[PDB]
């Protein structure tokens, strides 16, 4: 039967092949919800083209691109499967991929959700932890869309804007951590340092009140609680781009910092992005790792597998949608509140949109 | 009879009267574990005098001094009583007050714990969330004491170095929040914004890897989980002293930021310090509260009361010591791991000291 309940899966998406890099960077640096530059429509095209080469190299270092589109579909298909059996009253359920910087674009998925004549549309963020630069932008995209077309929705919108401590998300992290630990020498297992690595945020964003850091910290605690604190752990922030100040200990300097101090068995954990992505300096660059071993004696730096296609993740997705439908909520209580120092007119307009939806 | 189990309650302490302010700051600015200044033994004395007036004024604004000594005693007495019934095998128990910058000083309490011939001494930090500047300093003080007195322990030490998510602690917070919410007009209650306010940390401390922020974040999530996200919330960092950069949104700015954005009913929650301390700029200064009420229409700003003398707190303190003894652990797994960017050699010595304790 015709599709009743649509499920828009929001994520920034990623460049499918090295060829898509430029179009990805382009839309990203044009995102006024992610950032703001002086002349914007002019230097954005440049900045993209400019550093497009080094980003292409980075993606080449991990397989030649991002597998998010494939992975997201598998999970989407696995989620829909369970939704039909979980909540028949809202079936048939259909998932749509709403990527922010690559096809299928958010706006592209919305237009199809419309054309398909759905009764209930659910903006389901794929970032467990809320940041105004990730979920906020994907959510502002939906808003901006209708404000553009000029027209109003033809279906009821609602949203699952965050889920940093969902019990199944936590069980997945716990499972994957235990799996890697077993890849460490039997007698080293106990002294392995778990470094939860999440993407950093510029301090100016943190200081305006972004909820992201506190949420990621929450996810980390649930995980360790579940693992019964079997090992020591630390939450560090990876990558970080630019000369300006970014949050907490950088993942790079924390790894080096840890080896110069006796901890040689490190287990990195991607706690804030569910799909494979660009790794850290000590994982990609060899000379820097060569020095780290000749000067600190680093013996093991492992990475827990991304939630990728774990069957228990789909179950996590389906459960969230199900509770959502049950609860009748339009959005979390946290979305009804903008950053204490929020300076984006759009933000408040997006709040209204979801809290003002029919039913 | 003779006291079998001793319990050292660690905390920075506070000047009981305006007269004690000077020696308080003195010992504080002299704490190399808290901060490092050039020719510190010559600067601390100066900074103390140069700041004492400002602080006396602040303590006056809240009653004339700090009530931590009395409150810690009441909780101490109430902790002991519950321990003699809970742990008959380690009873009788005796609590000792080890304040870092005021009498009874940490060293004074240690020196008395031995004289009483204790079989087991427990360093129990009163800060639920671990920071190297609070719990770390209190713990490095115990180690520094034996490295000074030359001799070694006559009792078997162990420590409860953190407890950010202890269910009873979380329950006390959830109870005090519900109670303040009931002071707001029945119809504005759902609009109240919960501002969890914790003492900020210098960004240089956050970046070296202090666990404090992540743990404080955990406390916050457990509390809102318990209250079922009844209201929207934010974790902001208060006080913040100096010119350099300190962490996340500042309490003063967020309050103003929140009012400038239509949020008039705010509820402040002291999530990282269990006793009364210096309030924020908008709770003290009259002119600032005036400027705010005019340009924002701030209806009500309330502060949840400190855990202070809640009996459910003593039940919390007691439950922890009991579990600690039953678990037969010497310290948390987190203590065995230093900051990835740590540069205080004492840290490592304090670690060894506790993990190397007999039994
Ligand atoms: C406002 C704050 C943020 C800014 C300005 C930001 C900027 C960027 N983020 C990028 C990529 C990326 N960022 C990413 C996840 C996040 N990024 C985040 C927050 C920000 N990310 C948060 C929060 C994330 C959550 C999970 C991912 C997954 C990529 C794609 C590349 C890679 O590093 O995996 C790129 C393009 C690649 C590069 O090396 O230039 C920029 C300019
Ligand atoms: C390394 C990081 C830290 C520095 C440099 C720091 C510095 C200070 N902290 C003070 C007082 C204080 N700090 C306090 C809780 C904390 N302080 C903390 C971390 C730090 N605190 C953390 C973490 C806390 C919470 C658990 C309290 C309760 C006081 C006493 C007065 C007040 O703000 O109530 C004073 C004395 C008042 C003044 O302005 O001279 C200084 C200089
Ligand atoms: C002046 C402005 C800062 C605005 C702000 O934060 O308030 C900054 C932000 C982005 C910067 C630009 C980007 O870093 C891209 C270029 C980097 C080159 O090294 C200099 C020119 C370059 C084109 C920069 C010019 C200038 O420093 C910019 C435009
Ligand atoms: C990542 C990119 C290039 C730096 C690099 O070569 O790694 C830099 C250049 C322009 C930078 C942005 C501009 O300086 C404008 C903003 C300044 C704010 O303090 C942080 C976010 C902010 C939106 C910056 C994010 C990031 O640092 C940018 C986008
Ligand atoms: C030079 C040194 C920085 C060393 C460091 O941490 O890297 C800084 C840190 C603390 C500073 C001092 C403190 O801020 C206290 C005083 C503040 C006064 O405004 C100037 C002198 C004053 C006595 C400062 C002198 C100098 O700027 C100090 C000593
Ligand atoms: C705020 C206070 C007094 C300065 C003043 O007289 O106005 C100053 C004196 C000593 C300073 C501290 C010391 O310089 C040691 C640290 C130096 C780091 O770069 C920042 C945090 C750091 C922990 C400083 C925080 C703050 O600037 C202090 C605590
Ligand atoms: S930037 Fe966070 S609500 Fe607007
Ligand atoms: S400063 Fe944190 S372990 Fe030394
Ligand atoms: Pb302080």
UniProtKB/Swiss-Prot annotation, chains A, B:
Changing residue 322 to P: In EPP1; loss of activity. It is a peripheral membrane protein. Changing residue 75 to L: In EPP1; enzyme retains 18% of activity. Changing residue 46 to A: Increases activity inhibition upon interaction with PGRMC1. Its EC number is 4.98.1.1. Changing residue 219 to I: In EPP1; enzyme almost inactive. Changing residue 315 to N: In EPP1; enzyme retains 37% of activity. Changing residue 342 to Y: In EPP1; enzyme almost inactive. Binds 1 [2Fe-2S] cluster. Keywords: 2Fe-2S, Acetylation, Disease variant, Heme biosynthesis, Iron, Iron-sulfur, Lyase, Membrane, Metal-binding, Mitochondrion, Mitochondrion inner membrane, Porphyrin biosynthesis, Transit peptide. Coiled coil: none annotated. Disulfide bonds: none annotated. Changing residue 342 to S: In EPP1; enzyme almost inactive. The modification N6-acetyllysine is found at residue 351. It is found in: Mitochondrion inner membrane. It catalyses: heme b + 2 H(+) = protoporphyrin IX + Fe(2+). Pathway: Porphyrin-containing compound metabolism; protoheme biosynthesis; protoheme from protoporphyrin-IX: step 1/1. It is an enzyme of class 4 (lyase). One of its GO terms (biological process) is regulation of hemoglobin biosynthetic process. One of its GO terms (molecular function) is iron-responsive element binding. The modification N6-succinyllysine is found at residues 74, 351. Belongs to the ferrochelatase family. Catalyzes the ferrous insertion into protoporphyrin IX and participates in the terminal step in the heme biosynthetic pathway. Homodimer. Homotetramer. Interacts with PGRMC1; the interaction results in decreased FECH activity. Interacts with ABCB10 and SLC25A37; this interaction forms an oligomeric complex. Forms a complex with ABCB7 and ABCB10, where a dimeric FECH bridges ABCB7 and ABCB10 homodimers; this complex may be required for cellular iron homeostasis, mitochondrial function and heme biosynthesis. Interacts with ABCB7 and ABCB10. It is linked to Protoporphyria, erythropoietic, 1: An autosomal recessive form of porphyria with onset usually before age 10 years. Porphyrias are inherited defects in the biosynthesis of heme, resulting in the accumulation and increased excretion of porphyrins or porphyrin precursors. They are classified as erythropoietic or hepatic, depending on whether the enzyme deficiency occurs in red blood cells or in the liver. This is Ferrochelatase, mitochondrial. It comes from Homo sapiens. The lineage of its organism: Eukaryota, Metazoa, Chordata, Craniata, Vertebrata. The gene is FECH. The chain holds residues 65 to 423 of 423 of the full protein.
């Amino acid at each position: 039967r015709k599709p009743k309940t649509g499920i828009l899966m929001l994520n920034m998406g990623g460049p499918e092949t090295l060829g898509d890099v430029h179009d990805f960077l382009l839309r990203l640096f044009l995102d006024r919800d992610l950032m703001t530059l002086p002349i914007q429509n002019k230097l954005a095209p440049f900045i993209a083209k400019r550093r497009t080469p080094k980003i292409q190299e980075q993606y080449r270092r991990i397989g030649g691109g991002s597998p998010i589109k494939i992975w997201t579909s598998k999970q989407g298909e696995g989620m829909v499967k369970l939704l039909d059996e979980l909540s028949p009253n809202t079936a048939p359920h259909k998932y749509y991929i709403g990527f922010r910087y690559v096809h299928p674009l958010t706006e592209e998925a919305i237009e199809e959700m419309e054309r398909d004549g759905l009764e209930r549309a659910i903006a389901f963020t794929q970032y467990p932890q809320y940041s105004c630069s990730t979920t906020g932008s994907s959510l502002n995209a939906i808003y901006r869309y209708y404000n553009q077309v000029g027209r109003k929705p033809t279906m009821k919108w609602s949203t699952i804007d965050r889920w940093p401590t969902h019990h199944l998300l936590i069980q997945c992290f716990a499972d994957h951590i235990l799996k890697e630990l077993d890849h460490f020498p039997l007698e080293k297992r106990s002294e392995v340092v778990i470094l939860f690595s999440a993407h950093s945020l510029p301090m100016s964003v943190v200081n305006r009140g972004d909820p992201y850091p506190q949420e990621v910290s929450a996810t980390v605690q649930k995980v360790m609680e579940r693992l019964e604190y079997c090992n020591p752990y630390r939450l560090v922030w990876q990558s970080k781009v630019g000369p300006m100040p970014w949050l907490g200990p950088q993942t790079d300097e924390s790894i080096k910092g840890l080896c110069e101090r006796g901890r040689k068995n490190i287990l990195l954990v991607p706690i804030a992005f569910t799909s494979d992505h660009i790794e850290t300096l000590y994982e990609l660059d060899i000379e820097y790792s060569q020095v780290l071993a000749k000067e600190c004696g680093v013996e093991n730096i492992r990475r827990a597998e991304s939630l990728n296609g774990n069957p228990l993740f789909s179950k996590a997705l389906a459960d969230l949608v199900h509770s959502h439908i049950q609860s009748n909520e339009l959005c979390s209580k946290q979305l009804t509140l903008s950053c204490p120092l929020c300076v984006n007119p759009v933000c408040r307009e997006t709040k209204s949109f979801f809290t003002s939806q029919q039913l």
